[PDB]
A paper describes a structure:
The major pathological hallmark of AD is the accumulation and deposition of amyloid-beta (Aβ) peptides (amyloid plaques) outside neurons, followed by the formation of intra-neuronal tangles of the protein Tau, the loss of synaptic function, neuronal death, and irreversible damage of the brain tissue. Here we present the cryo-electron microscopy (cryo-EM) structures of six lipidic Aβ40 fibrils that assemble from three filament folds, providing structural insights into fibril–lipid interactions. Indeed, the three lipidic Aβ folds are identical in the central β-strand formed by residues Q15 to A21, with only minor differences in the sidechain rotamers, but they differ in the conformation of the N- and C-termini.
The L1 fibril, which is most populated in the cryo-EM dataset, is composed of two intertwined protofilaments of the same fold, related by an approximate pseudo 21 screw symmetry. The high-resolution cryo-EM map allows us to accurately model residues D1-V40. Following NMR assignments for 37 residues, NOE data revealed contacts between the phospholipid acyl chains and residues D23 to G33, the hydrophobic residues L34 and M35 as well as part of the N-terminal β-strand (K16-V18), identifying the additional density in the cryo-EM map of L1 as lipids. In the case of L1, extra density is located between Lys28 and Val40, extending over 3.3 nm, corresponding to the combined length of two acyl chains in a DMPG lipid molecule. The L1 fibril also reveals a compact N-terminus due to inter-protofilament interactions mediated by V40. During molecular dynamics simulations of the L1 fibril, we observed that the hydrogen bond between D23 and K28 breaks but also reforms, with the hydrogen bond being present in 52 ± 1% of all conformations, in agreement with the peak doubling in the NMR experiments. Furthermore, such interactions are present in the lipidic L1 fibril and in both ex vivo Aβ42 fibrils, supporting the disease relevance of the lipidic fibril L1.
Numbering used by the authors:
A (entry chain A), B (entry chain C), C (entry chain E), D (entry chain G), E (entry chain I), F (entry chain J), ...: 1 to 40
The structure:
Amino acid sequence: DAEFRHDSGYEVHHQKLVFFAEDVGSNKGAIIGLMVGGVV
Amino acid sequence: DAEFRHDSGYEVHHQKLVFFAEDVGSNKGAIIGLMVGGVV
Amino acid sequence: DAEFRHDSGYEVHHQKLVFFAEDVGSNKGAIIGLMVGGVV
Amino acid sequence: DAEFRHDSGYEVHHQKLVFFAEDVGSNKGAIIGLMVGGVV
Amino acid sequence: DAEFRHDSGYEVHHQKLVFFAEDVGSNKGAIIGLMVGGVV
Amino acid sequence: DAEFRHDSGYEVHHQKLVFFAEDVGSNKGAIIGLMVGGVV
Amino acid sequence: DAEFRHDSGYEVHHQKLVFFAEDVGSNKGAIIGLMVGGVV
Amino acid sequence: DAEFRHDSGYEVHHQKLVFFAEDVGSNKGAIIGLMVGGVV
Amino acid sequence: DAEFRHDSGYEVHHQKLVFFAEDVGSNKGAIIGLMVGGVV
Amino acid sequence: DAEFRHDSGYEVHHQKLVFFAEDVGSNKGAIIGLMVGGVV
């Protein structure tokens, strides 16, 4: 008379999660508000 | 008289999740608000 | 007299999820609000 | 007298999901609000 | 006297889903609001 | 013996120029690359 | 014996120029690359 | 014996120039690369 | 015997220039690379 | 025998220049690279 229940609400085996964020709100280039040249 | 229930609400085996975000709201190029040249 | 139930509400085996977002709201090119040249 | 039920509400085996988004709301080209040249 | 039910509400085997979105609301070309040249 | 020449190559009096561009390459509505719902 | 020449190459009096660009390459609405819902 | 030349190459009187750019490459709305919901 | 030349190469009187750029490459709204919800 | 030349190469009287740049490459809204919720 055995029972053997395995009711683990969440069972996870060999899970591999990678969350990668790169370059979020980053500036790798020029941002210039104004360029003014040769103004008389 | 065995039972053997395995009622794990969520059972996950060998899951591999990759969430990749790149270049979200990023500027890799020029943003210039104004260029003004040769103004007299 | 065996039973052998396997009622896991969610059963996942060997799932591979890739969520990839690239270049979302990103500027890789020039954005210029105004270019003004040769104005007298 | 066996039973052998396998009523997992969701059963997934060897699923591979790829969600790819690229270039969503991204500018890879020039956007210029105005170009004004040779104005007297 | 066996039973052998397999009533998994959703059963998925070897599913491969690819959702690909590219170039959604993206500008790879020039957008110029105005070009004005040679105005006197 | 008067002369009174007025040879101005370009003579402009009381000119009013309005160049208006609105909504050029602009999205005021939804753009969705894919909607997928209820897929099994 | 007067002369009175007025040969100004470009003569401009009371010129009013308005160059207006609004909403050039701008998104005021939603852009979604993918919406995926209820996928099993 | 007067002369009275007024050969100014460019003569400008009472010029009013307004260059306005608004909302050039700007996002005032949502841009979402992916929305994924209810995926099993 | 007067002369009275006024050959100023560029003559500007009462010029008013307004260059306004607003919201150039600016985000006033949400940009989300991915939203993932309810994934098992 | 007067002369009275006024050949100033650039002559500017009562010029008013306003160059205004606001919100150039600025984020006033949320940018989120990923939101992941309810992942098992």
